[PDB]
């Protein structure tokens, strides 16, 4: 696929620009809460608003975020870091 993109992992599973082959989860149905995810996803390059990993293909998160799994307990939005 693209060259990087496996969700700008400060500290969870594989990142945004490193891996590329583990699993990663898809966008929900509700646009916003969509955009929400964005922001655990990285943002402006984190840094430069230069476009890289533009949120167009289809950016989706990864595994070791969650708590448990299918998330649950209290943990929504992909945020862990
Ligand atoms: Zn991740």
């Given at each position: 696929?693209?060259?990087?993109?496996?969700?700008?992992?400060?500290?969870?599973?594989?990142?945004?620009?490193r891996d590329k082959?583990?699993?990663?989860?898809?966008?929900?149905?509700?646009?916003?809460?969509?955009?929400?995810?964005?922001?655990?996803?990285?943002?402006?390059?984190?840094?430069?608003?230069?476009?890289?990993?533009?949120?167009?293909?289809?950016?989706?998160?990864?595994?070791?975020?969650?708590?448990?799994?299918?998330?649950?307990?209290?943990?929504?939005?992909?945020?862990?870091?």
């Amino acid at each position: 696929g693209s060259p990087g993109f496996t969700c700008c992992v400060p500290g969870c599973y594989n990142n945004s620009h490193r891996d590329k082959a583990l699993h990663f989860y898809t966008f929900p149905k509700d646009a916003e809460l969509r955009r929400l995810w964005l922001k655990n996803v990285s943002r402006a390059g984190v840094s430069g608003c230069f476009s890289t990993f533009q949120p167009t293909t289809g950016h989706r998160l990864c595994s070791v975020h969650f708590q448990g799994g299918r998330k649950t307990y209290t943990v929504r939005v992909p945020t862990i870091f």
